[PDB]
Scaffold this active site. Structure first.
Site, PDB file in Angstrom:
ATOM      1  N   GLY A 274      37.718  67.161  47.953  1.00 28.69           N
ATOM      2  CA  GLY A 274      37.457  68.468  49.039  1.00 28.69           C
ATOM      3  C   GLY A 274      38.428  69.234  48.284  1.00 28.69           C
TER       4      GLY A 274
ATOM      5  N   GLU B  84      49.660  54.941  43.550  1.00 29.27           N
ATOM      6  CA  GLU B  84      50.165  56.756  44.154  1.00 29.27           C
ATOM      7  C   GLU B  84      50.849  57.620  42.984  1.00 29.27           C
ATOM      8  OE1 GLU B  84      52.016  57.327  47.376  1.00 29.27           O
ATOM      9  OE2 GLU B  84      52.528  59.684  46.549  1.00 29.27           O
TER      10      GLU B  84
ATOM     11  N   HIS C 153      36.103  60.843  48.044  1.00 31.07           N
ATOM     12  CA  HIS C 153      35.949  62.329  48.453  1.00 31.07           C
ATOM     13  C   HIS C 153      37.010  63.468  47.747  1.00 31.07           C
ATOM     14  CE1 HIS C 153      35.911  65.489  51.579  1.00 31.07           C
ATOM     15  NE2 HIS C 153      35.338  65.909  50.519  1.00 31.07           N
TER      16      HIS C 153
END
Lengths: 139, 139
Positions: free
Chosen positions: A109, A63, A107
């Protein structure tokens, strides 16, 4: 290529001062056009009580890495990113050395980013795989 | 009720010596017949670089808690437990105080355990929800 801000390893490392990344010895180590790499020691700082790397510590590395990767991909004058969902499979145990994580994009976005993070110990065998979803939020 | 070994909080806390749980200040705080509770400070030890609780630190707390819960449910003369899969939704950010996690069992099978772990900050609002799958392994 992937990046908006060119990764600066000294800056990435310095920015961890007074946070968990500094405490656990996370070190951003490398980057290219498609990925960002960081490693973490496997010792008493990151062990669970039985002498193996804590599965949660693998997640801290994943993370930390993915969050930093997101920060380097957004317009930081308008947006910030925070973790939204994280998941990991713990594949192999580690007792010593370092664990290395490599993040690649799945991805990017407008409102979410999804990162693929692969971890391995010094023997090079896969030890953990994580997937991280970050929310992109107006400043 | 759930437990094979009666939880002993002093022992749970002491066993964290020289591991990440001690480093981050994780404290096992309470238990009943159905649950085990631990908390962790939200400060420089557990912050990410922007001053919020690191999402991975929430996962360290959840996996510390659930791993200990599994240990208290198996025959430790024959088996040990290790994390197999973990996942979490990060619901609300926290800047200070403590974060408290409560673990409850979803399923204790012969070869896997599944735990539900709910986290909240001092205001009591849900801040993270995690689910942890442990493998039960012959010693």
């Amino acid at each position: 290529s992937l990046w908006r801000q060119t990764p600066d390893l000294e800056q990435l490392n310095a920015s961890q001062k007074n946070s968990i990344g500094d405490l656990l010895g996370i070190r951003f180590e490398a980057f290219d056009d498609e990925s960002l790499t960081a490693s973490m020691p496997v010792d008493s700082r990151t062990h669970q009580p039985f002498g193996l790397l804590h599965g949660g510590a693998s997640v801290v590395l994943a993370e930390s890495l993915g969050s930093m990767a997101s920060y380097l991909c957004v317009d930081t004058s308008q947006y910030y990113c925070v973790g939204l969902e994280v998941n990991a499979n713990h594949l192999r145990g580690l007792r010593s050395g370092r664990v290395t994580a490599v993040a690649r994009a799945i991805h990017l976005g407008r409102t979410t980013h999804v990162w693929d993070i692969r971890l391995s110990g010094d023997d090079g065998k896969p030890s953990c795989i994580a997937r991280l979803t970050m929310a992109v939020v107006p400043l």
